[PDB]
């Protein structure tokens, strides 16, 4: 039914494939870690309409990616990850935000932030300055682990709900 192009960006370590990873797992394989850049394809009802997803799972702004300027542009919508024990990680967002507006020349691109790693106790990125960052964007943010699975799926929604709002506009 409904396409959506959906392009997961962050520092390299914040957990971008973990998390791409175990919304598109169907478990048949018991671990699998990618080192490369790839896509993957999610079939979702989301608000009662079937949703396919396509998932591309970026590398850091060091690993280089002849093509990652057409999938910004191919991309209806960005996860943008940090790390909540990982203060560099979460002063990036900015670069990966700037990328995106440079390729799609606009500042109203569907995104979601996305703390991951809220599984640990220890964390030094507090929930206030991401909630204060998502603001100064106008996008959600959303705390996720891939390891207990919190709000992985829900990251993922509430990304594909930003996509139907923005294009209803
Ligand atoms: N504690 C914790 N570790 C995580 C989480 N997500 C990913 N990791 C770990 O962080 C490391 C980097 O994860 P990876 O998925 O390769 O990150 P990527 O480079 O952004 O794709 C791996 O050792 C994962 O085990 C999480 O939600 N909680
Ligand atoms: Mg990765």
């Given at each position: 039914?409904?396409?959506?192009?959906?392009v997961?960006?962050?520092?390299?370590?914040?957990?971008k494939?973990?998390?791409?990873?175990?919304?598109?797992?169907?478990?048949?394989?018991?671990?699998?870690?990618?080192?490369?850049?790839?896509?993957?394809?999610?079939?979702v009802?989301?608000?009662?309409?079937?949703?396919?997803?396509?998932?591309?799972?970026?590398?850091?702004?060091?690993?280089?990616?002849?093509?990652?300027?057409?999938?910004?542009?191919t991309?209806?919508?960005?996860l943008?990850?940090?790390?909540?024990?990982?203060?560099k990680?979460?002063?990036?967002?900015?670069?990966?935000?700037?990328?995106?507006?440079?390729?799609?020349?606009?500042?109203?691109?569907?995104?979601?932030?996305?703390?991951?790693?809220?599984?640990?106790?220890?964390?030094?990125?507090?929930?206030?300055?991401?909630?204060?960052?998502?603001?100064?964007?106008?996008?959600?943010?959303?705390?996720?682990?891939?390891?207990?699975?919190?709000?992985?799926?829900?990251?993922?929604?509430?990304?594909?709900?930003?996509?139907?709002?923005?294009?209803?506009?």
């Open positions: 039914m409904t396409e959506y192009k959906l997961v960006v962050g520092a390299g370590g914040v957990g494939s973990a998390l791409t990873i175990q919304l598109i797992q169907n478990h048949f394989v018991d671990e699998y870690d990618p080192t490369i850049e790839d896509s993957y394809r999610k079939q009802v989301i608000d009662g309409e079937t949703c396919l997803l396509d998932i591309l799972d970026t590398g850091g702004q060091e690993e280089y990616s002849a093509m990652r300027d057409q999938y910004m542009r991309g209806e919508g960005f943008c990850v940090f790390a909540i024990n990982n203060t990680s979460f002063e990036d967002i900015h670069h990966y935000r700037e990328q995106i507006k440079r390729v799609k020349d606009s500042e109203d691109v569907p995104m979601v932030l996305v703390g991951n790693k809220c599984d640990l106790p220890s964390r030094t990125v507090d929930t206030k300055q991401a909630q204060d960052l998502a603001r100064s964007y106008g996008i959600p943010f959303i705390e996720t682990s891939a390891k207990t699975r919190q709000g992985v799926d829900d990251a993922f929604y509430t990304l594909v709900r930003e996509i139907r709002k923005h294009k209803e506009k």
